[PDB]
Design a binder for this molecule. Structure first.
Ligand SMILES: *[C@@H]1O[C@H](CO)[C@@H](O[C@@H]2O[C@H](CO)[C@@H](O)[C@H](O)[C@H]2NC(C)=O)[C@H](O)[C@H]1NC(C)=O
Ligand SMILES: *[C@@H]1O[C@H](CO)[C@@H](O)[C@H](O)[C@H]1NC(C)=O
Ligand SMILES: *[C@@H]1O[C@H](CO)[C@@H](O)[C@H](O)[C@H]1NC(C)=O
Ligand SMILES: *[C@@H]1O[C@H](CO)[C@@H](O)[C@H](O)[C@H]1NC(C)=O
Lengths: 498, 232, 106, 54, 55
């Protein structure tokens, strides 16, 4: 599969202009290689209408320009003065015309009271009348089948197709417009007028994210739909939405540990984080606001469109850390190597309808009180990673653990702690001037060292080494302190003592 | 009694790290009292020069007035001016030189065309034409090499950048090399190297021989093997 | 639907595979070996030294690229050579760019 | 295993454990997806101006 | 994108060659081709060349 991703379907009226963005994986080839926009005709091939080196064809001369934002990671094609020969099948791409690396845009031009609403909203159908009928049976009918069918009468009838959701001002206000009701109506008092109502389907808002990266859906809605139970479906291959979050409780068997539905604002602009995106998330998502948390008609939806490219620069950290109870885990969270000087953080997992992630530690220093003594955020190795060591485990502190950072573009890496049954790999006294620490022979290359734990991490404390001891044994000749191991630059098994 | 002014090419900046700039005075009468002073936009003076040359056998004097600047001074579009103070011309003339700011960089596409098969029938000569399309600003520096060794400059003629027909602000150039028809029907890979300020490592190069470029014979011989295999 | 077994990009072979869930008879399902070589035909033998002979033999042992002498340039990896270009006195051997738009330094 | 497993596979690793090994583990696996093809198709294309292998 | 066909008028003397281009019989615009002025050929004695591209 080819990692460019554009708009799959573009609609615009003759005379108006088009802006078509297409994204690419921002490598150092793809920043500088040739970017085309070719017209896939019939009987063969691309005919390059406007390249990015500086060709602009005979047709698109004076009306098109292709620019290239390589840091934004995208290139944009502006085309003014459309006509109906600008309809058909186009590709936006990189490199040579033949070799793929492209995306297939389908340009589709259309010919030029009136109303134009989005789904589920209000509209006010307005119609003028004369003074001689100022008490008559005013009405609104719908033109289907070359005959006005009754929709709104005066005496209190509303249609089974339009039950209750509409009141009468003269004018008439309808509420919860669904796409089937996007009709071309008529109003009558002996005068008449037409009435025209298009209801658009809310357009994609293309989101090109990364494999093993993360995505933030910014769902912004209105003061009519603040207290309505918001959701995020995912419109799959039929018509149904297999819902992914809710606000009344639900989530998915798939998205365990990863969805974070953030709290509402005063504007109702709740946001949703997904993390650890895999290749099967690459499709249309839809936030919305209906009561019973399923996708129904009358609901002010607002879609998106993901694309999870497979050409990542994100490194492949292990997702499952397996620690034995009362043992040790030492995980590395990767972060953007440009964004080295920033404030790291860590997290727990608490469901999606909660959608919480409270801060355990950071890099400034503040650790939660219920984790003190057993927890240290590190920095070594730098040049790309940051390590966190957690020991003195427990059956209920298995879970999903998020490696936040205060950077600009964020890969909220989620790592999963599996608390198995087990024995400790390290033997230490229970709760204790010399303190011993008993290391297995597997740690032979590893450097044996003690720490003085605080909110500042580990500072070194000396000791002297023995010979064979039933393996290895070290001393603590002299709050909470540990006796971990170190392998060159990374960190391993630590055990705590009082 | 004319005057020429020679600003530095990019392939004299990049290739010798010596962004010196000259103005030569020729056509003049074979007199003396030459003072060729290089002055900035603020009138101020720069370093001097040496090696003011001789007159001609052909009795028209030739002199060369040099200065050395820094690179960051030159790229900022400062106005430099050499003033010639001769006994013949009663006004000590200014020749003005500036690297004109505000032009884009574009990358030259170097395609190398092999000699026509209407020309390899006379058994006399063959002409290979390097074609440096579509770049900006001027001053490409084409040179050729035959079998890893740089050919002598008596053999190729690089054109000057004249602007391209359809493209608005992008130039192009040429270079033809005349190799004898016996030296082409042997093999003899030729390479065309160009140097330009928008190319990646500042330099690119193409190549052609008898068998690669426009051949009358395509002799593929592919073999697949162990096609079943044990592939994971 | 298919699984890429090999995506080799210096010979440009691309062996994949796919189980064809047939007409719903018993397990008469087939398995494929969709090899997709793309043969260079104007690249030299030494890919980086462009003063070499052309190519005739293109040998694809598809064990020894399922587990070198490359035939094609890879697109992302960038290739160079060093030429003796002159300009006046010196023969300043500077470093070219066989395939450009990939050797742009950051 | 069930024969009915061999439309869906589940890939069946068999890991050995001997003393002349680094990990003392030489795990292998074979599914229905492995094994013999009974339909090849070589598809080799040829082109003067190739040589970049996108 | 675009093809640059080149006419290489070599070997002649004196100057003032005049190259123009025709497609199928009727001559093209002069906006599309670019003739160089004649340049003297260096290997041969005082005989010029020229060239003219059409894109
Ligand atoms: C021809 O291929 C050889 C190996 O098959 C290449 O090997 C050497 O390549 C490195 C990398 O650039 C150079 O630093 C060495 O100097 C090369 N060795 C020699 C003896 O030149 C080599 O790059 C190719 N030939 C040329 C002339 O580049
Ligand atoms: C054409 O191909 C055959 C088969 O490999 C070969 O034997 C023959 O010499 C080739 N001829 C030419 C002219 O390349
Ligand atoms: C074509 O290639 C084959 C294999 O290398 C070779 O034997 C044959 O002589 C070639 N043909 C010519 C005319 O060189
Ligand atoms: C290889 O075979 C499969 C199945 O028979 C077929 O779908 C595919 O198109 C073939 N490959 C090519 C390149 O046509």
């Amino acid at each position: 599969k080819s990692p460019i991703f554009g708009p799959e379907e573009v609609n615009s009226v003759e005379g108006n202009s088009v802006s078509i963005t297409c994204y690419y994986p921002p490598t150092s080839v793809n920043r500088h290689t040739r970017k085309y926009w070719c017209r896939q005709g019939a009987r063969g091939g691309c005919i390059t209408l406007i390249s990015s080196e500086g060709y602009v064809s005979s047709k698109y001369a004076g009306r098109a320009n292709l620019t290239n934002f390589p840091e934004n990671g995208t290139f944009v094609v502006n085309i003014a003065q459309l006509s109906q020969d600008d309809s058909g099948r186009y590709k936006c791409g990189l490199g040579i015309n033949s070799r793929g690396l492209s995306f297939d845009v389908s340009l589709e031009v259309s010919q030029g009271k009136v109303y134009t609403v989005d789904l589920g909203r209000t509209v006010t159908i307005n119609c003028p009348f004369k003074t001689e009928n100022a008490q008559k049976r005013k009405s609104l009918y719908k033109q289907i089948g070359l005959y006005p069918v009754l929709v709104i009468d005066s005496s209190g009838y509303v249609n089974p197709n339009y039950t209750g959701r509409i009141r009468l001002d003269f004018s008439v206000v309808i509420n919860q417009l669904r796409l089937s009701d996007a009709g071309q109506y008529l109003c009558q008092a002996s005068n008449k007028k037409n009435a025209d109502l298009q209801v658009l389907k809310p357009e994609p808002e293309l989101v090109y994210e990364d494999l093993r990266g993360s995505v933030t859906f910014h769902c912004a809605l209105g003061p009519e739909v603040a207290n309505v139970a918001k959701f995020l479906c995912r419109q799959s291959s039929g018509e149904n939405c297999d819902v992914v979050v809710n606000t009344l409780g639900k989530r998915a068997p798939a998205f365990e540990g990863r969805i974070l539905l953030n709290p509402q604002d005063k504007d109702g602009s709740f946001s949703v984080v997904i993390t650890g995106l895999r290749k099967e998330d690459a499709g249309r998502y839809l936030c919305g606001a209906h009561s019973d948390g399923q996708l129904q008609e009358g609901s002010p939806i607002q879609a998106w469109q993901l694309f999870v490219n497979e050409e990542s620069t994100i490194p492949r950290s292990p997702t499952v850390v397996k620690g034995v109870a009362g043992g040790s885990v030492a995980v590395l969270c990767p972060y953007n190597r440009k964004e080295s000087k920033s404030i790291k953080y860590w997290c727990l997992w608490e469901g999606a309808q909660n959608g919480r992630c409270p801060l355990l530690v950071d890099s400034e220093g503040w650790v939660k009180a219920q984790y003190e003594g057993r927890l240290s955020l590190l920095e070594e190795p730098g040049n790309g990673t940051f390590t966190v060591i957690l020991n003195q485990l427990t059956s209920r502190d298995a879970g999903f653990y998020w490696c936040l950072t205060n950077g600009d573009t964020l890969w909220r890496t989620t790592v999963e702690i599996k608390i198995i049954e087990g024995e400790p790999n390290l033997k230490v006294p229970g709760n204790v001037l010399k303190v011993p620490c008993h290391f297995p022979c597997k740690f032979s290359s590893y450097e044996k060292y003690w720490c003085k734990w605080n909110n500042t991490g580990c500072q070194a404390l000396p000791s002297q080494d023995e010979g064979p001891s039933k393996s290895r044994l070290v001393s603590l000749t002299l709050g909470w302190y540990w006796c971990g191991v170190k392998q060159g630059h990374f960190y391993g098994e630590t055990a705590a003592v009082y | 009694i004319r005057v020429f002014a020679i600003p530095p090419s990019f392939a004299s900046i990049f290739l010798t790290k010596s962004t010196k700039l000259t103005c030569l005075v020729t056509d003049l009468t074979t007199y003396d009292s030459v003072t060729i002073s290089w002055t900035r936009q603020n009138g101020e003076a720069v370093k001097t020069h040496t090696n003011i040359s001789e007159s001609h056998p052909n009795a028209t004097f030739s002199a060369v007035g040099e200065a050395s600047i820094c690179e960051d001074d030159w790229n900022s579009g400062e106005r430099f001016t050499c003033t010639v103070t001769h006994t013949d011309l009663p006004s000590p003339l200014k020749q003005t030189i500036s690297r004109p700011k505000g032009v884009a960089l574009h990358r030259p596409d170097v395609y190398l065309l092999p000699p026509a098969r209407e020309q390899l029938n006379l058994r006399e000569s063959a002409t290979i034409t390097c074609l440096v399309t579509g770049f900006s600003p001027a001053d490409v520096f084409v040179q050729w090499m035959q079998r890893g060794q740089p050919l002598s400059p008596e053999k190729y003629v690089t054109s000057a950048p004249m602007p391209e027909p359809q493209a608005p602000g992008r130039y192009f150039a040429h270079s033809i090399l005349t190799v004898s028809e016996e030296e082409w029907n042997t093999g003899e890979t030729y390479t065309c190297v160009v140097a330009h300020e928008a190319l990646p490592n500042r330099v690119t190069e193409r190549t052609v021989d008898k068998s690669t470029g426009k051949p009358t014979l395509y002799n593929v011989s592919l073999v697949m093997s162990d096609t079943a295999g044990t592939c994971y | 639907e298919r699984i890429v077994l090999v995506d080799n990009k210096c010979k440009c072979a691309r062996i994949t595979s796919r189980i064809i869930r047939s007409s719903e008879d018993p397990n008469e399902d087939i398995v494929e070996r969709n090899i997709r070589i793309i043969v260079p035909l104007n690249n030299r033998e030494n890919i980086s030294d462009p003063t070499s002979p052309l190519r005739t033999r293109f040998v694809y042992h598809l064990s020894d690229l399922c587990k070198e002498t490359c035939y094609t340039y890879d697109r992302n990896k960038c290739y160079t050579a060093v030429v003796p270009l002159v300009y006046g006195g010196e023969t300043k051997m500077v470093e070219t760019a066989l395939t450009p738009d990939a050797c742009y330094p950051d």
